[PDB]
């Protein structure tokens, strides 16, 4: 397969409709994105056999608190969502994985996807949020590909074997 670029940590308003295939070095923010009015979400990495550890967390002009915990030998990508600024972020999603890799696309209505799992096998699945943010910065904390959301199954590949 083939990817645009790779391109650097970037905030804006990116193209809706393609797969922006992050690949983190280090642990900590790798997205995020709000609107200020409706959705708020960030995906924190979680190193692989880390103890359970209290951290703060300064992204999208917020300092919040989370707690991280992984025994597992896989690298672990963590989301976290509210829909008011003074409501209290929540964790809904994550992806267990052995490569740092995931992946988030924008939709024709503005929401968000990306991937899902307790693996990158069997329980793999490619989620979609329910608070749709058209316009919005997005923010990618990392090194990125592109790739068309006409390739979905080429993003599929890497976040499944690697790059």
């Known amino acids: 397969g083939s990817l ?7 905030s804006s308003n990116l193209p809706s409709n393609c ?3 992050v690949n983190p070095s280090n642990d900590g923010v790798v997205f ?3 609107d200020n009015s409706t959705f708020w979400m960030f995906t924190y990495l979680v190193l692989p056999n880390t103890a359970q550890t209290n ?3 300064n992204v999208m002009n917020e300092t919040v608190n989370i707690s991280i915990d992984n025994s597992g030998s896989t690298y672990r990508f963590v989301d976290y ?5 003074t409501q209290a972020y929540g964790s809904r999603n994550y992806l267990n994985t052995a490569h740092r890799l995931q992946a988030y696309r924008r939709d024709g209505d503005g929401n968000i996807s990306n991937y899902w799992g307790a693996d990158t096998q069997g ?6 949020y329910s608070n749709p943010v058209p316009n ?8 990125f590909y592109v790739i068309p959301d006409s390739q979905q199954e080429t ?7 690697g790059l």
């Open 4 to 10: 645009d670029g790779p391109y650097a940590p970037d």
């Open 19 to 21: 797969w922006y295939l």
């Open 32 to 34: 995020s994105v709000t």
């Open 55 to 57: 951290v703060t967390v």
């Open 81 to 85: 969502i509210k829909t008011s600024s």
């Open 123 to 128: 329980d793999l699945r490619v989620g979609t």
């Open 136 to 143: 919005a910065v997005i923010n990618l904390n990392a090194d």
């Open 155 to 161: 993003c599929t590949e890497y976040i499944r074997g």
